[PDB]
Design a protein around this ligand. Structure first.
Ligand SMILES: Nc1ncnc2c1ncn2[C@@H]1O[C@H](COP(=O)(O)OP(=O)(O)O)[C@@H](O)[C@H]1O
Ligand SMILES: Nc1ncnc2c1ncn2[C@@H]1O[C@H](COP(=O)(O)OP(=O)(O)O)[C@@H](O)[C@H]1O
Ligand SMILES: [Mg+2]
Ligand SMILES: [Mg+2]
Ligand SMILES: [Zn+2]
Ligand SMILES: [Zn+2]
Lengths: 632, 97, 629, 201
DNA sequence: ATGCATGCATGCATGCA
DNA sequence: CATGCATGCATGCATGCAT
């Protein structure tokens, strides 16, 4: 019974190389000793191991000529066993708090969480060692052969739980004899201890009762998540699949629904021989950095300086949005101003005013409206794309649901809650039911939702910017009808937009040749024609817009006097046309607020603390050119 | 083809027209029927039989019964100025039997 | 323990009137004079005193022990005070009672969805609104056993939630094994209750939804919070393992969490006090005014621009709209409530409808009224249902049993319910209001429930005209999109018309633009206004005199002397006039309604629906006769 | 699936139908390894079940080892164990062949290892495998019932997707050297766009 | 001026947990 | 099996255009 087998591993030599690495490696003194010093001194609750460091250490030791072992390979194959080995070594080399403070299982004494960081690809190519832990895989490529290894999965998060306490080492106490018993837990359910097991109680005929002590137990933080496949990975004609993830320690709250991520972990198993699986998270990597995580590190300053000192930045950053689409310079400028936004305003009293810009594009067939909402949903770090048909109103706001992990009942949010602090690009705006658009009004104006159906009586938060696409009433434009009647949006909905462009397709033998040449060049060569313009890459553009969003310009009086005069001029000029029925509506204070917001955004893009008057001039020029196709 | 309240058992139950074979069917409020009732009565009065194709059961049943029906005219008052065919909702195919 | 009982003992616009006295000594004396047994303790008062600086932190980390230490210290101080002064009243009854301390104003929190496991068994504070409250649950503290062979009885005390069962009779004569039996009805019990709390968005990061908590209240704080109240609680953070089955004893690794309530605070500075007429048959319910605040109230009551100042102070960041502000102000006060014992019953609640062009600050006003009210829910028209406003039947997830819950219009009783998009709302979802706007009641007869429920609140509604914009080419009653019986209930109907005018255009443009010169910019502050309104609501009930009856009758017959081209006068305009006149009298703290209040009522009614600038024959607005003024 | 009777039990059969219900692929344990640090040695246990082999083998008492013979405690080595994939699918009679108005018949099929994911629901499939019987239809029990029988299923060893009209699977042919040569020869003619065009319908 | 056709809005049927 | 929410299908009503 229980025979024996021979393997090439050796859990003695590897532990020695572990200690050598952990107290002799340098990129200041030893690298990891300092991290342990911070842990002792109570400034760090997490220690992270970079496999690149281990690889470099063993490569250097090979250069020394002394024989060693392939530690990284051993970790990659069997990774759930090296966690405790590293914890043991870390518990035998810890220092004593240089600063001041104000048998038992070893885990009660530990206060730190060990995590492994996958092995990079560039280091692998540097030292010719093909890396298995840094190869992204789909949820459909993870099969039984991978159980027990350290791998990475690329996907999109769908559902996330709420952090909860999970007991790893229950503690008890005996009122009769005074001993302490410890029980380790590694399962979803457990049975507690009942009667004392000490020497004294054992000898005596009266055995005491034990009591759980909450304060002494080792409670950890537990969270669970679900990850799906990206549409670029699913095979032809199939449906995407899902996978589960566990998060324990100081990684909780590092995953939010809707985020495209690369997550590293250990693929571990859970009456039959069949078994459930899950990924124990060890390191997360976001594909698009959130704007509200920005810091002006030296590198990011060096990168933004080149853009600042390169002259034209407004045109450079507006020509770089969808560089395969010819023309539409003003449209791209207003869409670049969409990303930045104005400056929210609280008046200190119980009143607030939004600071985001809403934009609408109404035009004729085949003018590339959709392909610009698909590029704006990709530049933004938290973008969402939806089509008018495929929507329900509730599907945009919220509904009810129950959490499998815990027993709580939860409210699920729609696309407008996923896009919070982001752009919610709506295509086919005209074709969705008017009883479905009316839920967009409150989001557009108050940046909230109010649900008063059964079970739920509450409010949500949706700090979203809406980029809408629509078409005239009967397909193409009809010059005979009035501009207002040709479109099919009520006045109340129109007022809530700040920019409403009319992209009418009027043939002209001269300009169509340019479009034809651009498109056919885009097809013969897979890139855009111009050899003088070098568009800013999405990452460098996102980094600049993130730096710009930190400002909050104010206004002077020399600009206030201009703004008021322009508002009076526009609001007088508008009544004539509106009465004449050849118009677009009637100017309202929301027009003034939109002008102010556009000026603020143009000021921010310049990295300024004051709004110049050339910004209120650019804003007025944009709002004017918005309708300069109807006057062909 | 329904489910029995007590025995948890399926039951093939014909309507009143199949249950009144060799008898008489007395129908009240004959002018306020839905599509299903009109179709069933049409089949019964045409062929004196009722077909069914439901839940694996494909069969025909005998409905050799007489029909006595009561109804009210359009608008709640008979208008002698018009033919009877315009005072009632029933179409001609059912009113010719 | 000795250090604590000593430190707490010794611990127990600059001005010097009463700030130089022993604050807690007078409280201790009034408490022994009145028989009260609680001494609310402000934590920051502990942080102030030099000696009790560590104790603060200890209480923040070891609440359950420090609380008992404080309770024992307070009892000892009471005994020492009574004995030391040789006071006449007996010290025997005091020994037959118990005392407690209810600390509050503990270090602020950050949000219950950010607490980690290393915060268990610590003191915290939360703020939210109440949704449900279970009935009284008897919890056991003492068990009673009887001998079924000798009839001897025992009493056992509890320890951390377990009872010990005597294995043998304790009498010498009779010592039969396993002869004891528990007698349930002879035992002792305390009370318990569980309450759902929904946290307010004090802070919420990107993309998360609301979070509901469970709170436990014991002994004397039972049935003190209703459904809809906004409260701030201070209590302990706890964890518990949950049994996976009612038979099996295999515990679940994942632990539940809850909060033990030690203090609850209801009143808030930035809102009015709850109407006292709906809790007559029913913890600081209301704020208490000193004689110094009452002096300021009386002084303000005699100013020459009181009615203008009060209106202008509400929503100070809105421009003009003086008459809308006046109507909303009169809404808050309300009319006097009458109680009949031979007829029926009538109550004064003022419903207001706001119809006008887009971009006229209709949403901002409703948001202001929402934040300066004790109870009320701000629900738009799109996301509502007939049941979601009145009442539903549901099933809890920690019991699996049935229960009737409360809807939006019941959570707002004694307050104001705000409804946007009153026009983009269903015709059947809107009919449930018919009973709630004249009868102030909600009769339900559904499967297993047959009841009638009081829902005594007022309605503030905002609606757009058909076609969005208002065109004076149709009668007034056609621009609005409501049927007769629903539009008669509203006491005030406001028309908010836009009009292009360079003067007001410049003035409002300068107003709006003055807010962007700085990032953080005669108006009485909010707290004093709320205090004033609360006092007026609670204390003054004006009465109608014969001098006003003759004016009301004349004015109503006058409105009736004047088809379907406008809102024809019904019998509910007369009652609207009575209620508005009573509210106007209440604002000035008078106790008699006179002619000058009925006149204000009629003037405001006529000014609301732009009657001074309408043609009686065609019933259409003359845009030249409407001016902002 | 309609014509499969008790006459064919324990025989190699081929059945064609429509895939109606697939399952979620899961791993199955086939060898479990352990490490003992006190002795510094590795041990291993093996497991088996009814659906592993065709012949019948006396059941073994599957039990996961926790303690070594000497008493030394063991820890699992998840990375050195063995797991094999396992799926279960359901096949039904095609709508193109089932009689109209009658409820269809179904049969379960079990796949493992390299045949574990090759078809998707709603496809036309042909499975070659052994028709087997398992368990005891109350025979072992002293008194269980008199209205039950043995459970049956197919131990698949070949699966083929079939191409039909208005169906997900796409047709495909094997191209030989002759076919390629003929295609290349035919493509030289100048009227190719007309030859390939007049031959449509 | 009347009739027919098309589009929209109101209702019901399903499906659910 | 009743209650109440979200999807999807069906019908009847109103408006506009053409004869
Ligand atoms: N100005 C343009 N530059 C480049 N391509 C264009 C341009 N206008 C139209 N196209 C092409 O025509 C197609 C229009 O598709 P789409 O974006 O759906 O148009 P729309 O959404 O306006 O109906 C795109 O595939 C695009 O490549
Ligand atoms: N009289 C006014 N006083 C102050 N702000 C105003 C006024 N009129 C319009 N506004 C502006 O209008 C915006 C609010 O419009 P809103 O109330 O949402 O329109 P609606 O009333 O149609 O819902 C605010 O940003 C506010 O600054
Ligand atoms: Mg498009
Ligand atoms: Mg509004
Ligand atoms: Zn003991
Ligand atoms: Zn006894």
């Amino acid at each position: 019974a229980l025979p024996s087998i021979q393997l090439p591993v050796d859990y003695n030599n590897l532990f020695n190389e572990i200690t050598d690495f952990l107290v002799t490696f340098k990129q200041k003194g030893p690298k990891y000793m300092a991290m342990l010093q911070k842990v002792a001194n109570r400034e760090l609750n997490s220690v992270i191991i970079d496999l690149d460091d281990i690889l470099q250490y063993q490569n250097e030791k090979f250069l020394q000529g002394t024989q060693a072992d392939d530690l990284v390979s051993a970790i990659q194959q069997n990774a759930n066993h090296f966690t405790e080995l590293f914890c043991r070594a870390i518990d035998n080399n810890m220092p004593l708090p240089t600063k001041e403070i104000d048998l038992f299982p070893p885990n009660l004494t530990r206060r730190y969480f060990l995590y492994f960081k996958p092995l990079s690809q560039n280091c692998a190519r540097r030292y010719r060692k093909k890396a298995i832990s840094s190869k992204p895989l789909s949820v459909r490529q993870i099969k039984g052969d991978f159980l027990g290894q350290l791998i990475t999965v690329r996907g999109i998060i769908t559902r996330v739980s709420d952090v909860k306490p999970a007991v790893e080492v229950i503690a008890y106490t005996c009122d009769q004899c005074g001993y302490e018993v410890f029980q380790e837990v590694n399962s979803r359910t457990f049975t507690p201890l009942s009667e004392c097991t000490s020497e004294e109680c054992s000898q005596n005929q009266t055995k005491g009762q034990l009591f759980m002590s909450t304060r002494a137990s080792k409670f950890s933080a537990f969270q669970e998540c679900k990850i799906q496949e990206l549409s670029q990975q699913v095979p032809v004609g199939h449906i995407p699949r899902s996978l589960n993830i566990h998060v324990n320690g100081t990684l909780v709250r590092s995953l939010s629904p809707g985020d495209i991520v690369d997550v590293t972990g250990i693929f571990l198993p859970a009456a039959g021989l069949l078994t459930e699986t899950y990924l124990e998270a060890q390191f997360v990597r976001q594909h698009k950095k959130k704007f509200a995580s920005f810091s002006l590190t030296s590198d990011v300053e060096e990168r933004v300086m080149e853009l600042i000192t390169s002259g034209d930045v407004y045109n450079r950053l507006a020509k770089s949005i969808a560089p395969e689409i010819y023309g539409n310079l003003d449209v791209k400028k207003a869409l670049l101003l969409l990303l930045v936004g104005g400056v929210d305003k609280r008046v200190g009293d119980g009143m607030k005013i939004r600071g985001d810009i809403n934009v609408c594009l109404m035009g004729d067939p085949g003018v590339a409206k959709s392909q610009l909402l698909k590029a704006i949903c990709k530049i933004s770090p938290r973008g969402v794309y939806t089509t008018g048909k495929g929507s329900s109103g509730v599907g945009l706001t919220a509904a009810v649901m129950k959490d499998p992990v815990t027993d709580e009942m939860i409210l699920e949010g729609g696309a407008l809650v996923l896009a919070d602090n982001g752009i919610c690009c709506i295509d086919e705006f005209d074709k969705m039911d008017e009883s479905d658009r009316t839920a967009i009004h409150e989001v557009m104006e108050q940046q909230t939702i109010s649900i008063s159906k059964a079970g739920i009586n509450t409010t949500l938060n949706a700090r979203t910017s809406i980029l809408a696409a629509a078409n005239p009433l009967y397909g193409r434009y009809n010059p005979r009808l009035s501009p207002l009647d040709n479109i099919n949006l009520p006045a109340a909905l129109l007022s809530r937009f700040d920019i409403l462009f009319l992209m009418l397709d009027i043939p002209s033998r001269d300009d169509d040749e340019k479009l034809a040449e651009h498109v056919t060049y885009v097809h013969m060569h897979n890139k855009q024609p111009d050899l003088d313009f070098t568009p800013v890459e999405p990452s460098k553009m996102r980094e600049y817009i993130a730096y710009a969003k930190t400002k909050r310009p104010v206004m002077s009086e020399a600009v206030n006097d201009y703004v008021v005069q322009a508002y009076i001029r526009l609001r007088q000029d508008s009544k004539r046309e509106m009465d004449s029925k050849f118009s677009f509506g009637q100017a309202t204070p929301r027009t003034l607020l939109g002008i102010i917001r556009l000026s603020q955004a143009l000021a921010k893009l310049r990295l300024a603390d004051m709004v110049d008057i050339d910004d209120v001039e650019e804003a007025l020029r944009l709002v004017r050119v918005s309708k300069e196709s109807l006057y062909q | 083809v329904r489910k029995d309240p007590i025995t948890k058992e399926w039951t093939l139950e014909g309507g009143a027209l199949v249950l009144a074979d060799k008898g008489v069917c007395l129908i009240d409020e004959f002018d306020k029927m839905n599509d299903q009732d009109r179709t069933s009565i049409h089949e019964a009065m045409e062929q004196q039989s009722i077909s069914i194709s439901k839940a694996g059961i494909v069969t025909t049943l005998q409905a050799r019964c007489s029909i006595i029906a009561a109804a009210n005219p359009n608008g709640g008052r008979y208008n002698s100025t018009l033919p009877l065919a315009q005072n009632v909702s029933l179409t001609e195919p059912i009113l010719s039997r | 323990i000795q250090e604590c009982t000593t430190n707490f003992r010794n611990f127990l616009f600059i001005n010097n009137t009463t700030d130089e006295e022993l604050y807690y000594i007078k409280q201790l004396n009034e408490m022994r004079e009145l028989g009260t047994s609680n001494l609310n303790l402000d934590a920051r008062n502990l942080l102030a005193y030099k000696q009790t600086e560590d104790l603060y932190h200890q209480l923040l980390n070891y609440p359950q022990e420090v609380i008992s230490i404080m309770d024992q210290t307070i009892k000892d101080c009471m005994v020492s005070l009574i004995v030391d002064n040789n006071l006449d009243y007996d010290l025997d009854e005091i020994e037959t009672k118990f005392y407690k301390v209810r600390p509050y104003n503990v270090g602020s929190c950050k949000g219950m969805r950010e607490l980690n496991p290393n915060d268990i068994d610590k003191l915290i504070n939360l703020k939210g609104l109440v949704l449900r409250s279970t009935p009284v649950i008897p919890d056991m503290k003492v068990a009673f056993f009887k001998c079924n062979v000798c009839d001897h009885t025992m009493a056992v005390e509890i320890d951390r939630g377990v009872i010990q069962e005597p294995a043998r009779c304790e009498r010498i004569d009779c010592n039969e094994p396993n002869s004891m039996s528990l007698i349930h009805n002879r035992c002792s019990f305390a009370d318990k209750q569980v309450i759902k709390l929904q946290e307010t968005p004090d802070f919420v990061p990107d993309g998360q939804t609301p979070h509901s908590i469970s709170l436990c209240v014991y002994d004397e704080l039972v049935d003190s919070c209703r459904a809809g109240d906004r409260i701030e609680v201070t209590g302990t953070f706890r964890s518990i393992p949950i049994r996976a089955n009612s038979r099996q004893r295999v515990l679940k690794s994942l632990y539940k969490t809850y909060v033990d309530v030690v203090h609850v605070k209801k009143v808030s500075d930035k809102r009015l006090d709850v109407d006292t007429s709906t809790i007559e048959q029913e913890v600081e319910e209301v704020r208490q005014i000193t004689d110094q605040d009452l002096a300021k109230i009386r002084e303000v009551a005699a100013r020459e621009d009181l009615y203008s100042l009060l209106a202008r102070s509400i929503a100070p960041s809105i421009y003009e709209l003086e008459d809308v502000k006046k109507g909303i102000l009169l809404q808050l006060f309300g009319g006097t409530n009458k109680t009949f014992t031979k007829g029926g019953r009538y109550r004064g609640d003022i419903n207001i409808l706001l119809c006008g062009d887009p971009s006229t600050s209709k949403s901002q006003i409703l948001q202001y009224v929402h934040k300066i009210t004790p109870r009320g829910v701000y629900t738009s028209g799109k996301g509502s249902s007939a049941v979601g406003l009145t009442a539903y039947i549901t099933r809890d997830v920690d019991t699996k049993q049935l229960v009737l819950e409360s809807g939006a219009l019941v959570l707002s009783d004694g307050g104001v319910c705000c409804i946007d998009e009153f026009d983009k709302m269903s015709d059947s979802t809107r009919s449930v209001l018919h009973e709630v706007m004249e009868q102030q009641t909600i009769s339900i007869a559904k499967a297993g429930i047959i009841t009638t429920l009081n829902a005594r609140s007022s309605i503030l509604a905002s609606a757009n005209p058909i076609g969005s914009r208002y065109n004076p080419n149709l009668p007034v009653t056609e621009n609005i999109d409501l049927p007769p019986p629903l539009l008669s209930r509203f006491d005030l109907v406001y028309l908010v018309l836009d009009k292009v005018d360079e003067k007001n255009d410049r003035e409002l443009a300068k107003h709006l633009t003055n807010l962007y010169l700085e990032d953080k910019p005669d108006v009485l502050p909010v707290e004093f206004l709320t205090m004033y309104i609360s006092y007026a609501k609670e204390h003054i009930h004006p009465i109608i005199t014969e001098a006003a009856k003759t004016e009301l009758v004349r004015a109503y017959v006058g409105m009736r002397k004047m088809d379907e081209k406008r809102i024809t006068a019904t019998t509910r305009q007369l009652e609207s006039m009575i209620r508005l006149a009573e509210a106007h009298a209440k604002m000035k703290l008078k106790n008699v309604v006179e002619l000058e209040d009925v006149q204000e009522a009629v003037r405001l009614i006529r000014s609301a629906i732009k009657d001074y600038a309408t043609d009686p024959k065609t019933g259409k607005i003359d845009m030249n006769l409407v001016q902002t003024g | 699936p309609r014509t499969l009777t008790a006459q064919h039990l324990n025989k190699l059969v081929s059945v064609e139908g429509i895939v109606t219900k697939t399952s979620l692929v899961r791993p199955k344990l086939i060898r479990s390894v352990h490490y003992a640090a006190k002795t510094g040695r590795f041990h291993y246990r093996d497991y088996t079940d009814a659906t592993t082999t065709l012949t019948t083998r006396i059941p073994t008492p599957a039990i996961y080892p926790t303690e070594d013979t000497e008493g030394n405690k063991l820890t699992t080595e998840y990375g050195y164990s063995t797991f094999i994939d396992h799926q279960r699918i359901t096949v039904q009679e095609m709508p193109e062949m089932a009689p109209a108005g009658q409820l269809p018949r179904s049969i379960d099929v079990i796949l493992d290892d390299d045949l574990v994911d090759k078809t998707k629901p709603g496809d036309r499939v042909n499975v070659v495998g052994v028709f087997k019987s398992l368990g005891a239809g109350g025979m072992n029990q002293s008194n269980s019932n008199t209205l039950i029988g043995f459970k049956t299923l197919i131990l698949g060893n070949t699966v083929y997707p079939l191409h039909a009209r208005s169906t997900g699977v796409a047709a495909r042919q094997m191209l030989t050297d002759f076919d390629i040569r003929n295609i290349n020869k035919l493509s030289k003619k100048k009227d190719i766009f007309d030859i390939l065009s007049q031959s449509l319908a």
